[PDB]
Structures are given as C-alpha cells and as structure tokens.
Amino acid sequence: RKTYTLTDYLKNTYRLKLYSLRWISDHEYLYKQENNILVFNAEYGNSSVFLENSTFDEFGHSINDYSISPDGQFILLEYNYVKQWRHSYTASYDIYDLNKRQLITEERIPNNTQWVTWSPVGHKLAYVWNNDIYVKIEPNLPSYRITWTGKEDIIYNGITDWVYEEEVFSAYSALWWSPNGTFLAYAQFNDTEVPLIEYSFYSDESLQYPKTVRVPYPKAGAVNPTVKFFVVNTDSLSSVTNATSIQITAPASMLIGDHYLCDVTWATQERISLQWLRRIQNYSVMDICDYDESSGRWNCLVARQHIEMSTTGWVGRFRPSEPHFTLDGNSFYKIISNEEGYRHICYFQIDKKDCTFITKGTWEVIGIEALTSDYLYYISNEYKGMPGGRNLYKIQLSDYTKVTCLSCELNPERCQYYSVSFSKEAKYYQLRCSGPGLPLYTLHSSVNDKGLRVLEDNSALDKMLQNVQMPSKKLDFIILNETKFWYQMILPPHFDKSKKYPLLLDVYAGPCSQKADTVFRLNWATYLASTENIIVASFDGRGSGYQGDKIMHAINRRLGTFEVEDQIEAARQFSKMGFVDNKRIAIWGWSYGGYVTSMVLGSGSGVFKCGIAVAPVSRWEYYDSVYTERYMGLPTPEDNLDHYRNSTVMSRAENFKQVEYLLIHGTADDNVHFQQSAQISKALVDVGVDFQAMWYTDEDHGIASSTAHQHIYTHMSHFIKQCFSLP
Amino acid sequence: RKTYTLTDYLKNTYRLKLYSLRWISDHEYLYKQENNILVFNAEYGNSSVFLENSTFDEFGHSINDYSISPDGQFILLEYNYVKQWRHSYTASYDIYDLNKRQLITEERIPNNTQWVTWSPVGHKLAYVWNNDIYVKIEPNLPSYRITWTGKEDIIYNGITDWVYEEEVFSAYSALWWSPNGTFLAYAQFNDTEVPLIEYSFYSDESLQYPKTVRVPYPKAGAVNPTVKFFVVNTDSLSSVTNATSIQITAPASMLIGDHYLCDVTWATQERISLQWLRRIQNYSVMDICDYDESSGRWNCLVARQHIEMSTTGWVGRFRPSEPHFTLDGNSFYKIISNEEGYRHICYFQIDKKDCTFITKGTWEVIGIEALTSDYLYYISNEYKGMPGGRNLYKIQLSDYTKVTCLSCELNPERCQYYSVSFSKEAKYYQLRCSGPGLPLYTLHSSVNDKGLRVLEDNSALDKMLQNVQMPSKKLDFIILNETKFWYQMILPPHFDKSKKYPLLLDVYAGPCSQKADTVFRLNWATYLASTENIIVASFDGRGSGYQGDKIMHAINRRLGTFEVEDQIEAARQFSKMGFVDNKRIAIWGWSYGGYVTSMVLGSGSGVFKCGIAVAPVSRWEYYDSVYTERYMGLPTPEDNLDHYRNSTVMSRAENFKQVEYLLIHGTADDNVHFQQSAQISKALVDVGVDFQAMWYTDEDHGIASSTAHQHIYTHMSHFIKQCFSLP
Ligand SMILES: *[C@@H]1O[C@H](CO)[C@@H](O[C@@H]2O[C@H](CO)[C@@H](O)[C@H](O)[C@H]2NC(C)=O)[C@H](O)[C@H]1NC(C)=O
Ligand SMILES: *[C@@H]1O[C@H](CO)[C@@H](O[C@@H]2O[C@H](CO)[C@@H](O)[C@H](O)[C@H]2NC(C)=O)[C@H](O)[C@H]1NC(C)=O
Ligand SMILES: COCCN1Cc2c(nc(C)c(CN)c2-c2ccc(Cl)cc2Cl)C1=O
Ligand SMILES: COCCN1Cc2c(nc(C)c(CN)c2-c2ccc(Cl)cc2Cl)C1=O
Ligand SMILES: *[C@@H]1O[C@H](CO)[C@@H](O)[C@H](O)[C@H]1NC(C)=O
Ligand SMILES: *[C@@H]1O[C@H](CO)[C@@H](O)[C@H](O)[C@H]1NC(C)=O
Ligand SMILES: *[C@@H]1O[C@H](CO)[C@@H](O)[C@H](O)[C@H]1NC(C)=O
Ligand SMILES: *[C@@H]1O[C@H](CO)[C@@H](O)[C@H](O)[C@H]1NC(C)=O
Ligand SMILES: *[C@@H]1O[C@H](CO)[C@@H](O)[C@H](O)[C@H]1NC(C)=O
Ligand SMILES: *[C@@H]1O[C@H](CO)[C@@H](O)[C@H](O)[C@H]1NC(C)=O
Ligand SMILES: *[C@@H]1O[C@H](CO)[C@@H](O)[C@H](O)[C@H]1NC(C)=O
Ligand SMILES: *[C@@H]1O[C@H](CO)[C@@H](O)[C@H](O)[C@H]1NC(C)=O
Ligand SMILES: *[C@@H]1O[C@H](CO)[C@@H](O)[C@H](O)[C@H]1NC(C)=O
C-alpha cells in the first residue's frame, strides 16, 4: 500500500464528494449534476432536467454562477467575476427569460455590479452599482435608483465596508427584502473618517510602478464607520419622483456613543427586527419595528426592546444570536447563555419581559435550524457529552421535556458530526454527516422522521482509500486543574504505542475555537502522519468554544495569556505519553494560530524545538476594531492599554534564541497586514536572533492561489522535516 | 592560534587607522586628534591646537560635523543630522564666531536646512531651505532670498532630486560658487511629471498605520525631471528688491530633446564651463560661458562649444569627464577615450579645433589630480601593466615625453594602489596607499618630490594582525580568446594547492567595475577565508573597467549577457585549477552583483551549487532612467525593448530548480525597489521552485543599520556553511 503524499494533498488526488442542494419549495430542490440543473421531488426522488449543460454553449462568456428567480421564470447569469475581500466581488450579469428562452438585451444589469439579489417571491431585482441601490420591477424594464449618495471608499448603500463584511455580517450584502417583496430594507455605511491601510501591490511583471492599495480599515481604538438603516416601499416606485427611504433610528441607548448594527431579520410582512451592539461589546438591544399603514412610517416601541448584557465577557459567541420568529411574528426563539454559562434555547414573547429557557444542561445548542407550530429543530453537542460532536434534535413545543435525537443513532460509528438543511416549512430535511467516517448525505421526511434515501455516500473515495495507508484520529481529553480539556491526534498508520514519534502541535486557539472534533479531513496533517510518521495534535484550552462561558470567557480582556499557557501545558502532557519523542516537538498555526505559535515559541518554556507562524497577528493594536475590541476592550489608559502592550510578540524577541522559527506572510494581506510580521522580524533582528522567513508576493490572508498554496506547504514540509531529522 | 572570525568583522576588533586632513591653504592643513582640531604646517611639520575638544561641552546638542570658513573667522556646527538618500540629509546649524569666541544668536540658519556651504574665500554662506536658496553675506545679518519657486517633491533650487543626486552629481548640492565668491551658480530641477515610487515604511512598533513613502523616481523610459541653470551676482544683493538670477540656456542641440546637465566647472572669475548630455547618452556638449560686464548677461558663443560622441558606447566611464582649467582659463585638460579606446589625457585650447593627447599607451588614466604651470599630476594604472594598481605620475608640460612616476618605487611590495590630496596650488601632497599592504599615509613637497614625513603607517594594526592567521590575496589573470582577464583570490591561511577548497565567487560585474585590485580589505571574505577555509574569488570580465573600450563597451545595449557568461566561464577556469572542489562552488553579489548572481544561477550551467542575491535588480525597466538607459537605450520597440525583455531574472525561473538560492532585500529600498525581488519570488513560486528568502523591515539599499548588518552577514554565513557542509 502507498501512503498519503504531499502531492496527493496538493493535487487533490482523493476528493470528497458533496451533495449541495437548494430547496425551492416545501417539497422540491435544485441540484446541479454534470452541469445540468435538475429539479428533484423530495418525497419520491424523481427528477426532471430544468436546464441542460448545453444551453449556454454559445453564451460567449464563462458563466461563474447562476441564480434562478423564486418563481422559476428567470435565471441570472453571473460572469466576469473578480474577487475582492472574503465575501465581496464585482461581476457582470445577464438575465435569461425561461418562458421565451431568450436573453433580455435592453436595460441590462450594468457591468461591475457589486451585489444582485432576487426578491424572496416573484422576480423583482435589487442590485448595487457604484455603491448605490437600484431596483428592477421586471427584468426588461428600466431600473429605479433608490440611493444617490454612494461614493467609492466613503459611502456604501446596500453593501458593507471592509470591517462589516469581515466581522459583522459575514457578507458583502446589506440588503434585506421583506417576505413579500414589498419592502426593501438596507443599511448605509459611512467611512468618511476611517483611516486607510495602504500597501503595495506588484501585479504582473509588466507593471512598471507598483500600485498602492488603500482600504478604509479601523484598527483597534481608531475611528469606526457609522451606520444608518432605511426601508423603501418597492410597490410605490415612481418613474418621475426619486424613491423615498424611511430611516429607522437606533435606540437612544446606542446613540449615546459608538455602536454597530449587527442583525436584521424580517418577522412578518410588516415587522422587522433590528439588533444593535455597543462598541464596547457588553451590551446589545433588539428593536421590534412595525409598519404604520396610515403614517407610512416605521415605529419601534421602546417597551418592546429586548436587552442583552454580559458581565463575564462579550455578547454571543462572535455576536448576538439570530432570532427565530414564529409564523405570526409575535414570539421568537434565540440562543442565550443561561445562568450556569451554557448556551441554550430561550423562548421570547413580544410585549412580555424576560424569556423562558426550553433547553438546559452541561452542553450547548449550536444553532436553531427550523421551527414549525409543533417542533423546534436544533443542532447541539449533547450526545455522549462530546463537545466536538454535533447532532440534530427536535423538541416538542407543547412539552419541553420531550426531546428526540434525530441523527444520533443513524450511523453511530461513521457519523457524529451533522449539519442540516430543511425545505421551506420543514416538510423534509437533508442531513450532512462530516465524520468521523467519510461524509454521508441523506434525505428524510419530518412527519415521522423516516429515512427517504441516501443522496451521496462517497463510495468512490472509499474504494480509492482502500489502496492507501491512511492515518487514524484519536479524540479524547486530559485534565488540567480538575477540568476536562479535549484534544485530537492524527496518528500514523500502524501506530505502535511503544515507539517514540515526533509531534507537531497544530494550533488555532482563538476565542470560541474548536480544533478537537469528530470531522473527517484530508489535509496537510494527513500527509504528515501518513508519509512522515508525525503525530499531529490539536488542543482546545481556555477560550475554546461550545463548553460553556467559564471556559470561553477565561480569556476575556486577556488575549495571549491562558490560551497560550494551555497549549504549552498540553504539549508537556503529550510529552509524558510514552509514544512522544520529547526532543522533537514542533508547533505551527495560521492567523490567530500564528500569534499563539509565536507567543508560545517566545515563552522560553523549552518545550518546543521549532515552529511556524503563518500570517500571525503580532500586536492587537494592528488588528481590526470589531474583532479585537470584542475580546480586548479599547487600547486606552482608562481601559485595557496595559494588556495590549503586554501581549505583543515583539516583547518576547529574546527568547526566540532558544528555537528555530519560520515566519511567513503574504504581502497583499488586507486582513492581518504584512505590517504585523514586518514588526516581528525587526524585533528579532534588533536583538540578534536568527530565524527563517518567506514573503508571498501579492498573496492575501489565505495564500490560496494554486501556485502559492503548493509553494507554502512544500516550504513548510521541508522545514518540519529538517527540524525532525526525518530523511 | 586564532583566526579572523565573524565577530571580529561585525564588531571591528581590528581597526584600520586613517589620516583625513583638510588643506586650508598652500602650506597648512587641519587634522582632528582627540576631537582637538589641530593645524599643521606642511613644510616643517609643526602644529598647534586650533580648537580645543572642550570648546563646545556646554553646546547642548551633539555636534555631527563642523565646517570652518575659508578665512578662519567662523565655524559652522552641524547637529540634528537626519539622513535621506545616499548624499542628502537635513540638519540644524549654528555659527560660532572665532574672534569673539561667541555663538551667533542673530539671523540663524533655519532648522531642517537641506544644504549649506561657505563661499570659497571669505565667509559668505549659501544654504537651501524648503527647496529655496538663501545667501548670508555676514553670519549675523539677515539672509537674502534668491529663489521663490521651491516646492517639496516638485521644484528643487540648489539641491538635486533623487536621480540627479544618485546618478548625475553624486551629491545633494546643486550650488557652485565662483572662485571669487562673487557669483553663485545653481541648477533648478522640475519633477512635476516624474512618476512616484511608493512603498511602506513601518517605523517603530508604536505606529499603528504604516506610512507610505512617495519619491519622484523615473524608471527606465519614464518621464525625467527637467533642468535649468542660473547665475546670481552676490555682490549686488538688496534688502529691497529680489535677487536677479540670470538664466543660461542649454545649447540648441540639447534643447531639441530630453537632456541632462552633467557637470559645472568654474574656469575663472567670469567664465563658467557647463557640460550637457543627451538622454541618449552618446552625445554631450561643453559650453564655455562668459560674463559681460556691460550687460550683466552670460554669453555662450555657439562657436566655441566642444562636442563629444561615442559610437561603441556611452560618453565617459559613467559620465562626461571633468575639465581641468589652466589658471588663465584659456585651455583645459580632460580625460578622453583615444583612437585605440584607451582613456588618456587630452589638451584643449579654447577657440581651437580638436585636442592634443599628451599621454598614450595600453593602460588608462584614472583621474587628473592637480595642474600647475610646470606639471600636470594624474593617477593611472600604467605601472607593470596591472589594471588594478594605481600610481601617481607627473608630466612635464613643456615636454610631454618627460613623465615621472612619483609613487611607484616608494615601497613596491607594500604599496601598489595610491590616491592623493594636493594642497591649494599643489605645493604639497599627501599620498594615501591602500594596498596590497596595510594603508600608509605620507606627506611630500612638490618642488623636488621629496618625502617629508610619515603620517600614519598602521603599525598598531600590524602588530595585532601578526597574532592572527590571516588570508593571503592572489591577483592574477587568465587568457580568454587571447585577451587577459584579471581575477583575485582571498586564500585561506597556510594555503595548500594539493588540497581541495570550496570556492565562493564574489560578484559585482557592473559596467566599468573592477573587483580584482591591489587594495587591502578586512571584510566578510576575510572571515570566510581565515575561519571557514573558503577561497573567495572575483573576476573582471567583459564590461569591466580601466582596460580600454573594447572590454568596457562589450556590454553596450546588452546588460545581462557577456558579463554573466564570463563569471560562469571564470568559475569553470577556477575548477580546472587543482585546488578547487567543483562540487562546492557558490556565488553571491549585492545590487548589480545580485542581478548577475541571479542570472548566473538561472543559466542552468550546472557550475554552481548555491548562491545569494542581495537587493538584486530583476529587470531593467524597474531601475532608474539615467543609469539604465546609459547602457540599455530606451525600452521601446524602435530602440532596445527586445533586450530589456530577454534580460530579466524572472524568465529564467525554471532553471533555479537546479540550485539553492537565498534572496534578500530591504523593504525600504529607495534605490533598487523591493519590487524587483517581489517579482523574482513570484516567478519562482509560479513555477514551483523552492528557495530561501529574507526581507529586512525598513532597511534601505545598504542594509546598513548596525543590527541589520550583523543580522544579514550572520544569516548569509549560516547559508554558505550549510551549502558547503562546514562545521
Ligand atoms: C458621512 O460622514 C461624514 C463625516 O461625519 C459627514 O461629513 C459631514 O457632513 C456635514 C455636512 O456635509 C457636516 O457635518 C460636515 O461638513 C462634514 N464633516 C466631515 C467630517 O466631513 C457626511 O455628511 C456623511 N455623509 C453621508 C452621506 O451621510
Ligand atoms: C515645472 O514643470 C511644470 C510641468 O510642465 C510646469 O507647469 C506647466 O506650466 C505651463 C505654464 O504655466 C502650463 O501651461 C502647463 O499646463 C503646466 N504643466 C503642468 C503639467 O502643470 C511648471 O511651470 C514648471 N515650474 C517651474 C517653476 O518651472
Ligand atoms: C486561514 O484563516 C484561518 C481561519 N480563519 C481565521 C478567521 C476566519 N474567519 C473570520 C471571520 C475571522 C475574523 N477576522 C478570522 C480571524 C480571526 C482572528 C484573526 Cl487574528 C484573524 C482572522 Cl482572519 C477564518 O476562517
Ligand atoms: C551596496 O551597494 C553596492 C555598491 N554600489 C552600487 C552602486 C553604488 N553607487 C552608485 C552611484 C550606484 C548607481 N546607482 C550603484 C548601483 C549600480 C547598479 C545598480 Cl543595479 C544599483 C546600484 Cl545602487 C555603490 O556604491
Ligand atoms: C452534459 O450532460 C450529459 C448528461 O446529460 C453529460 O454526459 C455530459 O458530460 C455533460 N457535458 C458537460 C459535463 O459539459
Ligand atoms: C415526479 O413525478 C411526478 C409523477 O409523474 C410528476 O408529476 C412530478 O412533476 C415529478 N417531479 C419532478 C421534479 O420531475
Ligand atoms: C459589459 O462589458 C462588455 C465587455 O466588457 C460589453 O460588451 C458590454 O457592453 C457591457 N455590458 C453592459 C450591460 O454594460
Ligand atoms: C406584501 O405586504 C405588504 C405590507 O403588508 C402589502 O402592502 C402588500 O400588498 C403585500 N404584497 C402582496 C403580494 O400582496
Ligand atoms: C490551574 O491552576 C494553576 C495555579 O492557579 C495555574 O497555573 C494553571 O494555569 C491552571 N490551569 C488551568 C488550565 O486551569
Ligand atoms: C610653526 O612654527 C612656526 C615657528 O615658530 C610658527 O611661526 C608657526 O605659527 C607654527 N605653525 C603652527 C601651525 O603651529
Ligand atoms: C530649531 O528647533 C528647536 C526645537 O523646536 C527650536 O527650539 C529652535 O529655536 C530652532 N532653531 C532655529 C534656528 O530656528
Ligand atoms: C571677483 O570677480 C568678479 C568678476 O566680475 C568681479 O566683479 C569682482 O570685483 C571680484 N571680487 C573681488 C572681491 O575682487
Ligand atoms: C570567446 O569566444 C567565443 C565565441 O567564439 C565565446 O563563446 C566566448 O564567450 C568568448 N569569450 C570571451 C571572454 O571573449
């Protein structure tokens, strides 16, 4: 048998199959197979070809993606896609009339469009072009301009700026149609006084002078963008008069200082829910806003506000949780940290104070996935008390003590990590198992939770892997100070507990992270264990998520302390184990994991021989405001400046004398700026520490272009092999 | 027994002593001893203290340098010095009255002054501040503002812009006093349309956002700065009206296209010499400009212009040569390439055609050093036909065939490389011998060329080095195609030709370079040979200097060809010698040498195991116009674009799979932009070639800060030691 080699990883020789479907109604879904788009009937499994892979053969452009209108009458064709940040991009768009089978050729959606979306019913369109919002009532009719204030890098209507895209909304879009399609809600961001990160972009060899990229980007403590919220009635659009947006003001408790808009959820045709968060992310308010048919205005009764505070840390895992409204819009369910610090499902009634927990226990609800009049469906890590497992549950809304696990026993050896996708109104659901066995996609009907069929079982990959010496994974826990902390180890094939293997500690360790889990992965660690006989371990210490606030908030206002200390202690314990060579322990991480790796290597602990930090944070003052201040507060003498200064990699420079360090960073990293590693190397140079380095010209945080990806893993593999005296 | 170690190099354990003197008249000089300024009488050798080391103890600022006025009455004190590029800087200044022994507190020179200079006689001052020129007649009187057009990065009056500072005048100054101090001539540079190179400067940790540095910098083929020339009468300045600057325009043969002002020399009190050079640097014109008492204008008779052209290359070694005027100003001497392509001294009479060569032979004159009524003094490499030796000669003006060597036989074994400094009117001269033995400084009188006394013989260093196993240096030649090409080897102590040594080829190889010479050096190569037992070789191939145009111009319009090939062939030659291990040959270079090193590693020659390129050029379109176009013409389809494109490092990327490569660059390199290495690394990545790299944050082309310098030589030493399998 051959082994899983670096080339196998880099060339994607062993591929995981997926089953990506889009629910189109309560009983049908779209699935793209062999470039043909199909419609499936969930109950019986029969299908029809909706669009053949030949249709646009003479389109004239490579089609990047498609979006069929809700009523199936039109399809959007996305082409000329050019990526921007994590979510944003620009593209060109054509619209094809499915009824007449022809492209619409006038009043086209413009080129360089920044965002487009169908209404939730029908076929209205909203798009953003040059930072302004436009609406098309019909694909062939001229559009109506909703906003006129948009200016590059300054005013954003209907799309997010850098830090909202990355840290608040996880999306470029800041547009929200009402369930009906009647109203279009949108946010407007103002980056007027936000400072710019500037960095060079070298481009192709032919470019004589490097370009300077400039992005409004608030580092910790700097001026943040401001936000406004508006709602436009899309039924009353006039060809003669500019459209009229109604502003909805943030609560007074937010208007007293810096704040964020952090969630927008339509509750009914005439009720919108808005969540706001103070800049000190301690305090949030949910506003319920009702439409007044006579007034034409939107009002947010103060008495309806729901306030959420934390004294232990910040609000929510990364932000306040999403509300899930009942059909009538009069009550909702939301995940909330309970009195014991565990995140559970809470039932809220509008116009009543407080809430009622419907789940409890020493485990957490991960997400609320569907809600009907009879049941609420949710994913949690309760099963077998493993925080790194995930299963689907349903809870009987008329008796909260009746909770049934829908996924726990379907295939208990192969499947312990589930996610789910329900059709509209929750008639059917697709289950997606991610491990520990090969991913398995199944379809089910909710009425009695019957298994309908297997959609994808990865039998092909399974056959291929029969010919390979694959490594194994152990998931278990150690005890630090009377508490359980979980770890995982990728073990080489034919693991012999009597031998001594080198160990690489793979770290992330950011707040609410989880690197010990039951999911199946084919990655670099697979190669390291399979071919180089290296154990790759990961550990979830203080600050990790899904185990309660006592663990997650331990790190509050003190990044670079307990989570770094805990990675060190985990390695010590692994070294005790009689199968680890304590002379050959390495560490590596990317991003937050680069910071932790650097702090660990700079600790003088003597535990680690060498380490690799990829695109590390080095000083919290250099990273973005929304993320950083959530854990660290503000970098002022009045607040947390002292710990901002005590938690830099640079201050530990001298201790790097005791280790081999490889430092790697993309020069076009718009996220963790090259600046951060530039300051690390200068501190090392100033104190006479030798180290190794590699910049990646024009790569960003992901160092993800095909050639750079191959190059960085090839470079790191040489480094780790050298460090471990492996032939 | 000890060797010359890395730490000795880095920490300067063994220091070379100097004897820097400043002639202040025909028979006296200034010399600093224990920070005491002494004046010495050249004839008799007696001295006295001019300025006590204690004089300025209560000054309140650290004094960076001083400049005494020509008449001994005042001394300028430079403090708050801040370096800019190679020559430019800003500083604060104070003038101390030596007769009153008081600091002058009235009408002070402003802070952030860019350039200052006394008149050549008396005590007038011209300085530049905010890009405008000012003149003080007396140190305690208000200054007269001469120009009003100065503007940062756009209009420079009396100082040079980036490219003129670096490539044209080798100085920040663009002011020239007439011998009398009557006139002040000055250039004005206009950079309005020159593009900017932009790069990040990260600064101290405490700086939250990196700064973008922007410098007007014309890359090859881009818009160059424009230049004007003016002359002001300093004797007729008024406190009422502004100075009247008379413009002298360039010849009409220059005005037809882009051109440079390349040399300014005052011939008499009323005659200025100006040399102009076309942007295509094979055509230059010398103008002789005379003052007209009656009109106050300067007139340049078109008829007495001297024209210089080249068909095989560019004009001059790096630029048209300096004219040396006879006292009366009616004739001059200047170095000119003769009919055989050897650079010799030519005698020109103003208003007469052609010139008369007063020297000849297969060797070159390096510089004209002094001129009296009886003799012209010059440095050449005639002695023993060694192009890398330098000696002082004098030629009898009344009989050109009487040429006397003044330095050749002073100490033939210790001293073969001299420079010289003559007193005012050349009554005395200081000889400075730089090798092959320890530097030796002596004083002589011109009357009969009698040695007066030894000034510094480095006996102290000599006694220390006797305790060290020092390397020897061999200087010799190999014959390629019936031409002699010279090389040097730094050989390890107790060299044994029956042994095999690893060899490092130390490369520069730029046009008119010379890396094989008789100079004594204590450098990185000294450590490599003495401690690590590595032979460090350099070779002067096609394109090299001081050997005639056949060799120097071989590289015309073809950079990255013959000079690269010849380094490879030299390496082959070196292997065929029995004391070289051909499995351990490396190559390294900085700047142009980093370019050549990269081209060599990318040639696929198989000769070199590994190499290091520091701050290399990677393609000629990225480097500056004046230097690049001198050798390469313009990068246009009608001129030389094809060879610009065929001579990049990037196009050889695939071939780097055969070698180990270390690429190093400073991020704030204003000269060879980080961009050049950014593009090399991108090409290697794109093609799947592993290599090593190191950036140096905020270091410029010299990577010369104390900590960076130590870091880079330490890093390179590890790399060579690994590549050579050395303990
Ligand atoms: C975006 O925010 C900026 C800065 O707050 C606003 O700029 C101000 O605009 C008003 C009137 O134009 C005045 O207060 C000042 O003249 C501006 N101050 C600054 C700092 O420039 C700007 O109006 C906002 N733009 C939008 C579309 O809301
Ligand atoms: C420096 O050069 C600039 C650029 O050529 C000169 O600006 C030009 O001046 C003329 C006459 O005023 C205008 O008609 C042009 O439009 C200008 N060109 C540009 C691009 O601005 C400028 O006058 C020069 N400055 C000095 C002091 O010589
Ligand atoms: C290769 O990246 C490692 C995995 N990460 C890191 C990551 C991801 N997503 C988001 C939204 C964020 C928040 N900025 C982050 C993130 C977290 C911390 C720091 Cl210091 C930097 C970053 Cl970028 C993600 O997927
Ligand atoms: C550490 O530098 C190595 C030695 N050099 C290189 C050097 C020096 N002086 C001048 C005026 C120049 C012309 N720009 C150069 C130079 C020549 C070629 C290239 Cl491609 C880059 C450069 Cl910088 C010098 O002293
Ligand atoms: C188009 O679809 C057919 C099946 O209907 C498939 O066999 C063929 O490979 C497809 N062509 C592609 C993938 O472009
Ligand atoms: C499935 O089959 C039924 C019965 O013929 C048919 O009516 C329905 O349209 C089919 N669904 C799809 C998506 O083909
Ligand atoms: C978009 O660009 C394409 C080519 O770049 C051009 O043919 C077309 O006119 C543009 N389309 C629109 C809708 O502006
Ligand atoms: C959708 O809701 C709005 C607000 O209640 C209403 O005015 C409009 O008529 C509705 N649209 C449809 C399709 O009836
Ligand atoms: C346990 O307590 C000790 C002492 O208070 C402390 O050093 C250590 O970090 C703690 N460990 C954990 C993981 O709680
Ligand atoms: C040298 O000595 C002579 C004779 O005393 C004296 O006049 C002269 O000033 C001295 N020069 C110096 C510079 O000490
Ligand atoms: C130079 O700067 C210093 C510090 O601000 C100031 O005190 C001093 O007066 C300045 N000197 C002159 C000549 O303006
Ligand atoms: C210096 O030379 C110029 C030549 O025109 C003359 O006008 C001036 O008088 C001279 N100055 C002195 C100080 O003799
Ligand atoms: C010698 O001549 C041959 C061409 O016939 C060429 O390969 C080689 O480069 C030449 N060497 C030198 C230094 O002239």
JSON list of N, CA and C in Angstrom, two decimals, chain B residues 480-499:
[
{"chain": "B", "resi": 480, "resn": "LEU", "atom": "N", "xyz": [41.39, 34.49, -22.07]},
{"chain": "B", "resi": 480, "resn": "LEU", "atom": "CA", "xyz": [40.21, 34.03, -22.81]},
{"chain": "B", "resi": 480, "resn": "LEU", "atom": "C", "xyz": [40.18, 34.71, -24.17]},
{"chain": "B", "resi": 481, "resn": "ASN", "atom": "N", "xyz": [40.13, 33.90, -25.23]},
{"chain": "B", "resi": 481, "resn": "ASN", "atom": "CA", "xyz": [40.14, 34.44, -26.59]},
{"chain": "B", "resi": 481, "resn": "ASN", "atom": "C", "xyz": [41.27, 35.43, -26.79]},
{"chain": "B", "resi": 482, "resn": "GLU", "atom": "N", "xyz": [42.45, 35.06, -26.31]},
{"chain": "B", "resi": 482, "resn": "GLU", "atom": "CA", "xyz": [43.64, 35.89, -26.43]},
{"chain": "B", "resi": 482, "resn": "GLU", "atom": "C", "xyz": [43.53, 37.27, -25.77]},
{"chain": "B", "resi": 483, "resn": "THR", "atom": "N", "xyz": [42.58, 37.43, -24.86]},
{"chain": "B", "resi": 483, "resn": "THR", "atom": "CA", "xyz": [42.54, 38.63, -24.02]},
{"chain": "B", "resi": 483, "resn": "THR", "atom": "C", "xyz": [42.82, 38.27, -22.56]},
{"chain": "B", "resi": 484, "resn": "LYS", "atom": "N", "xyz": [43.60, 39.09, -21.87]},
{"chain": "B", "resi": 484, "resn": "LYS", "atom": "CA", "xyz": [43.82, 38.90, -20.45]},
{"chain": "B", "resi": 484, "resn": "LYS", "atom": "C", "xyz": [42.64, 39.40, -19.62]},
{"chain": "B", "resi": 485, "resn": "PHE", "atom": "N", "xyz": [42.16, 38.57, -18.70]},
{"chain": "B", "resi": 485, "resn": "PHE", "atom": "CA", "xyz": [41.13, 38.97, -17.76]},
{"chain": "B", "resi": 485, "resn": "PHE", "atom": "C", "xyz": [41.61, 38.70, -16.35]},
{"chain": "B", "resi": 486, "resn": "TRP", "atom": "N", "xyz": [41.52, 39.72, -15.49]},
{"chain": "B", "resi": 486, "resn": "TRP", "atom": "CA", "xyz": [42.14, 39.68, -14.17]},
{"chain": "B", "resi": 486, "resn": "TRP", "atom": "C", "xyz": [41.20, 39.16, -13.09]},
{"chain": "B", "resi": 487, "resn": "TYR", "atom": "N", "xyz": [41.75, 38.44, -12.13]},
{"chain": "B", "resi": 487, "resn": "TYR", "atom": "CA", "xyz": [40.95, 37.93, -11.02]},
{"chain": "B", "resi": 487, "resn": "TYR", "atom": "C", "xyz": [41.75, 38.03, -9.75]},
{"chain": "B", "resi": 488, "resn": "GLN", "atom": "N", "xyz": [41.05, 38.08, -8.63]},
{"chain": "B", "resi": 488, "resn": "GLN", "atom": "CA", "xyz": [41.71, 37.92, -7.34]},
{"chain": "B", "resi": 488, "resn": "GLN", "atom": "C", "xyz": [41.13, 36.74, -6.56]},
{"chain": "B", "resi": 489, "resn": "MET", "atom": "N", "xyz": [41.96, 36.15, -5.70]},
{"chain": "B", "resi": 489, "resn": "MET", "atom": "CA", "xyz": [41.51, 35.15, -4.74]},
{"chain": "B", "resi": 489, "resn": "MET", "atom": "C", "xyz": [41.95, 35.51, -3.32]},
{"chain": "B", "resi": 490, "resn": "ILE", "atom": "N", "xyz": [41.01, 35.57, -2.39]},
{"chain": "B", "resi": 490, "resn": "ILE", "atom": "CA", "xyz": [41.36, 35.57, -0.98]},
{"chain": "B", "resi": 490, "resn": "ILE", "atom": "C", "xyz": [41.57, 34.11, -0.56]},
{"chain": "B", "resi": 491, "resn": "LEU", "atom": "N", "xyz": [42.82, 33.73, -0.28]},
{"chain": "B", "resi": 491, "resn": "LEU", "atom": "CA", "xyz": [43.16, 32.34, 0.04]},
{"chain": "B", "resi": 491, "resn": "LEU", "atom": "C", "xyz": [43.28, 32.13, 1.54]},
{"chain": "B", "resi": 492, "resn": "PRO", "atom": "N", "xyz": [42.82, 30.98, 2.04]},
{"chain": "B", "resi": 492, "resn": "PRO", "atom": "CA", "xyz": [42.88, 30.69, 3.48]},
{"chain": "B", "resi": 492, "resn": "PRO", "atom": "C", "xyz": [44.32, 30.60, 3.97]},
{"chain": "B", "resi": 493, "resn": "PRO", "atom": "N", "xyz": [44.55, 30.86, 5.25]},
{"chain": "B", "resi": 493, "resn": "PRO", "atom": "CA", "xyz": [45.91, 30.75, 5.82]},
{"chain": "B", "resi": 493, "resn": "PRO", "atom": "C", "xyz": [46.52, 29.37, 5.56]},
{"chain": "B", "resi": 494, "resn": "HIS", "atom": "N", "xyz": [47.85, 29.31, 5.44]},
{"chain": "B", "resi": 494, "resn": "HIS", "atom": "CA", "xyz": [48.54, 28.04, 5.18]},
{"chain": "B", "resi": 494, "resn": "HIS", "atom": "C", "xyz": [47.92, 27.34, 3.99]},
{"chain": "B", "resi": 495, "resn": "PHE", "atom": "N", "xyz": [47.69, 28.10, 2.93]},
{"chain": "B", "resi": 495, "resn": "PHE", "atom": "CA", "xyz": [47.12, 27.56, 1.71]},
{"chain": "B", "resi": 495, "resn": "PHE", "atom": "C", "xyz": [47.94, 26.40, 1.14]},
{"chain": "B", "resi": 496, "resn": "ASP", "atom": "N", "xyz": [47.24, 25.35, 0.74]},
{"chain": "B", "resi": 496, "resn": "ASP", "atom": "CA", "xyz": [47.86, 24.13, 0.23]},
{"chain": "B", "resi": 496, "resn": "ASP", "atom": "C", "xyz": [47.23, 23.74, -1.10]},
{"chain": "B", "resi": 497, "resn": "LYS", "atom": "N", "xyz": [47.98, 23.88, -2.19]},
{"chain": "B", "resi": 497, "resn": "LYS", "atom": "CA", "xyz": [47.44, 23.63, -3.53]},
{"chain": "B", "resi": 497, "resn": "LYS", "atom": "C", "xyz": [47.13, 22.15, -3.81]},
{"chain": "B", "resi": 498, "resn": "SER", "atom": "N", "xyz": [47.61, 21.26, -2.95]},
{"chain": "B", "resi": 498, "resn": "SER", "atom": "CA", "xyz": [47.32, 19.84, -3.09]},
{"chain": "B", "resi": 498, "resn": "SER", "atom": "C", "xyz": [45.97, 19.51, -2.46]},
{"chain": "B", "resi": 499, "resn": "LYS", "atom": "N", "xyz": [45.38, 20.49, -1.78]},
{"chain": "B", "resi": 499, "resn": "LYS", "atom": "CA", "xyz": [44.06, 20.29, -1.18]},
{"chain": "B", "resi": 499, "resn": "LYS", "atom": "C", "xyz": [42.96, 20.83, -2.08]}
]
